[PDB]
Design a protein around this nucleic acid. Sequence first.
RNA 1: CUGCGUGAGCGGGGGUGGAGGGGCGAUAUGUGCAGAUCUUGGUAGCAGUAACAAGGAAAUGAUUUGCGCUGGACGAGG
Length: 128
Amino acid sequence: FDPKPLVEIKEAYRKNKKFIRHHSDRYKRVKPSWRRPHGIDSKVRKRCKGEREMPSIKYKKPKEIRHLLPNGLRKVRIFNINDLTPLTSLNRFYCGEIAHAVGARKRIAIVNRAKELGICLLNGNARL
RNA sequence: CUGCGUGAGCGGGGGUGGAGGGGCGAUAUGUGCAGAUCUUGGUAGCAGUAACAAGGAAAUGAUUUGCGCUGGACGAGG
């Protein structure tokens, strides 16, 4: 089908590189979120041997698998019972997710609609 | 603890918590920090360290005995 052969092209493009800020393992006041250096003596900016590597557009994914869920579908966020309506002509390419702040009274209503329409839920079986 | 994004960042799950919180378009800005012998607050190592005190005794201590030298009044100040 759609999910099964895509999940193995997705795995061919997985990188395990992280892009962590220089010296963030040495000072607690430097946070790990990425920043580019500007110093007059900076060696990360020159790409010397041994230093951490910088991010760039040559690591970006093909358009067909970028943002794919691990099971092979696209994610949609759902707040209402009326949010499921557009997922009827396409219920084999999407996987719904119920927002965190929706209460358990309304979650019963959403979970029953999606069962009688054949729509996958990434989030069901929680807070029940 | 876990998913997505080259990245700035954005989601979901289990505890805690006990009242509010968001998306999208235009618009107004006191709009993003590692440094300034930066400002204010809190906290380490140094270190239980330097420095200081432990005043002669007699089971008891209104009794016996050993040592030091300021002692008593008026004014200012309190």
